[PDB]
Each structure stands twice: as C-alpha cells, then as structure tokens.
Amino acid sequence: PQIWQLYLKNYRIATFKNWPFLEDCACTPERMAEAGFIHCPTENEPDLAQCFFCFKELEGWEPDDNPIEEHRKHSPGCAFLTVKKQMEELTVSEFLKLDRQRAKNKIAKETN
Numbered sequence: 001p002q003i004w005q006l007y008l009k010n011y012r013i014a015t016f017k018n019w020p021f022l023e024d025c026a027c028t029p030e031r032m033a034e035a036g037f038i039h040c041p042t043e044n045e046p047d048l049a050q051c052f053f054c055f056k057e058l059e060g061w062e063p064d065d066n067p068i069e070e071h072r073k074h075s076p077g078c079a080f081l082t083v084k085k086q087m088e089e090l091t092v093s094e095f096l097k098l099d100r101q102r103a104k105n106k107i108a109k110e111t112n
C-alpha cells in the first residue's frame with residue numbers, strides 16, 4: 001500500500017469532489033484520473049487538475065475534453081503517458097524504472 005496509492009486509479013478518482021461534469025462526457029472524473037490527474041482546486045482554481053506523475057498543472061476543462069490529449073499536449077514528455085498499458089499490467093521491473101523518473105520529476109518541481 002504505502003505512500004504512492006496515486007499509481008492506482010481508484011485513489012486518484014477519490015481526489016475528485018465538486019468536480020463539475022458529472023458523467024457521460026469525455027471529461028468524467030474516471031476519464032480524468034485515467035489520464036493521470038488528481039483534483040486539487042482552490043478559490044481561484046476550481047477545476048485545477050495535476051498529473052500525479054508529471055506534477056504539471058492544467059486548468060480550463062470542458063465536458064467534451066479528452067483529458068489524455070490535453071495531457072499529451074501540455075506535457076509531451078510524461079513517462080506515465082508512454083506506457084500504453086495500465087499500471088496493473090506493468091512488471092515490477094517497469095514500475096521501479098518508472099518510479100525513478102517520477103521522483104526525479106518531483107525534485108525538478110521544487111527546483112521550480
């Protein structure tokens with residue numbers, strides 16, 4: 001279990017609460033979390049989502065938005081996006097590979 005349940009959809013899905021766009025539209029909380037986003041709104045940033053992997057923030061969503069393409073567009077180099085396979089299907093080999101990058105990204109985020 002530990003501190004990285006965000007590798008798991010269900011946990012990312014949980015992050016969504018008050019997320020407008022409720023069901024049947026390309027931007028359901030399930031499609032979003034599927035793309036790697038978590039929900040972290042604020043006074044001024046109601047619909048602010050962030051990739052648990054890239055840490056890159058993005059705003060301005062609309063019911064008919066495919067979360068993956070916007071993610072793909074504004075963060076072309078997200079390793080999470082390369083794996084055309086759900087985390088559950090990644091070997092522990094690939095998961096440990098992948099998680100080396102994630103942590104490296106985290107630091108590059110405080111690097112600002």
Ligand SMILES: [Zn+2]
Pocket residue numbers: 036051052053054055056071075078080081
């Ligand atoms: Zn990302």
Ligand SMILES: [Zn+2]
Pocket residue numbers: 070073074
């Ligand atoms: Zn955009």
